[PDB]
Amino acid sequence: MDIQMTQTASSLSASLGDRVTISCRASQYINNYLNWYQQKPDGTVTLLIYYTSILHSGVPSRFIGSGSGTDYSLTISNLDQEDIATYFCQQGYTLPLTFGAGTKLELKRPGGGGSEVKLVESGGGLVKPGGSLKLSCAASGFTFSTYGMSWVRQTPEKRLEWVASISGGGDTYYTDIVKGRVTISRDNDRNILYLQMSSLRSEDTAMYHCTRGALVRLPHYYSMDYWGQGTSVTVSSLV
Ligand SMILES: COc1ccc(-c2ccc(Cl)c(Cl)c2)cc1Cl
């Protein structure tokens, strides 16, 4: 059965300089294979922490990841304007890869927020149910052929859903609800990742992000260490 990730709070209210802890619970043991992502108000997603407690590049030591078993926490000290964002946990222990629903950090007053691997998605658009699209992701700034790559979509309700992954060697993995309706593929000469989509359904409407997989532990524990800005797919009988 799929591992469900629960973030009980959807938003926490705090003041600048405060310390806040965001909880994440897995429905099953996940061997500390837990990643945290930060999504800024403008939609930009970055990796924050991988393997429960290890900071991604650029991330300041004010972020502390902890936990074990099924219970995990992200503690942010000395809360800064740039931390006003939504935080998502994600287990990478078994397929399908699954995400919590997100916890936003907000300030007591309204408002808040502040600010070489490149991934650029294209090919989204509007189609009727039963239609088809092909998404592309142009990658640069790294040796593309050595990395696993994935597609992750964010629904209009703001849920992150892993769609598909492809290993450096070309093995493919999909979430059940898209199997037989999408195909992930890659061109290691042009450094492009693709998602062919057939028989689209209204519930495929989402922003589709290309992500680079970084292998954390063999055989297949990955973090999604860089994310594109996304390409938007809208499926509606009103098209
Ligand atoms: C059998 O279990 C798995 C198989 C494949 C992946 C996986 C996850 C992310 C990426 Cl980027 C890639 Cl290439 C493979 C992850 C798991 Cl848990």
Q: Mind giving me the DSSP string for the chain? A: -PPPEE---SEEEE-TT--EEEEEEESS--TT-EEEEEE-TTS-EEEEEETTTEEPTT--TTEEEEEETTEEEEEE-S--GGG-SEEEEEE-SSSSPEE---EEEEESSS-------EEEEE---EE-TT--EEEEEEEESS-GGGSEEEEEEE-TT--EEEEEEE-TT--EEE-GGGTTTEEEEEETTTTEEEEEE-S--GGG-EEEEEEEEEEEETTTEEEEEEE---EEEEE-TT-
Ligand 1 contacts CB of residue 38 (under 6 A): no
Q: CA torsion angle for 9, 14, 19, 21 (degrees, to 10)?
A: 0
Give how far Cα 176 sits from Cα of 97, 111, 131, 163, 179, Å.
11, 39, 19, 9, 5
- CA–centroid distance, residue 37 to ligand 1 (Å): 18
* Residue 73 · residue 8 · CB < 8 Å: no
From 150, 165, 223, mutation site for ligand 1 pocket: most ligand atoms within 8 A of C-beta: 165
Q: Measured between alpha carbons, how far is 38 from 88 in angstroms, rounded to an integer?
A: 7
| Resolution of the solved structure (Å) | 1.4
Nearest Cα neighbor of 162 from 199, 200, 210 is: 210
CATH architecture assigned to 118-235? Sandwich (2.60)
The total of other beta-carbon atoms located within 10 Å of residue 1's CB is: 6
Beta bridge partners, 227, equal 211
Residue (of 124, 123, 151, 158) closest to 233 by Cα position: 124
Taking the centre of ligand 1 as the mean of its atom positions, its distance from the CA of residue 171, in whole angstroms, is 9
**Rounded distance, CA 43 to CA 57, Å?**
19
For ligand 1, is residue 94 a contact (CB within 6 Å)?
yes
Residues 6+ apart with CB under 8 A from 180: none
The answer to whether 1 and 95 have CB atoms below 8 angstroms apart is no
Query: What would you report as the CA-atom Rg of the chain, rounded to the nearest whole angstrom?
Result: 18
The answer to whether 4 and 93 are in contact (CB under 8 A) is no
Dmax (CA) for the chain in angstroms is 51
The rounded distance, in Å, linking the Cα atoms of 213 and 165 is 9
CA of 185 to the centre of ligand 1 (A): 15
For residue 186, how far is its CA from the centre of ligand 1 (angstroms)? Answer: 16
Residue 159: φ, ψ to 5°: -85, 135
User: 179: which residues sit within 8 A by CB, 6+ positions away?
Assistant: none
- Residue appearing with tokens 């970055």: 46
Nearest residue (CA) to ligand 1, atom 7: 220
The whole-angstrom separation of Cα 61 and Cα 173 is: 34
* Spatial separation of the C-alpha atoms in residues 204 and 153, rounded to whole Å: 9
* First-last CA distance in the chain: 36
Mutational test site, ligand 1, from 51, 222, 223, max ligand atoms within 8 Å of CB: 222
Please answer whether residues 46 and 56 qualify as being in contact, where contact means their C-beta atoms are separated by less than 8 angstroms: yes
- Residue 76 and residue 139: Cα distance in Å, rounded? 32
Ligand 1, residue 149: give the atom nearest the CA: 11
Structure determined via: X-ray
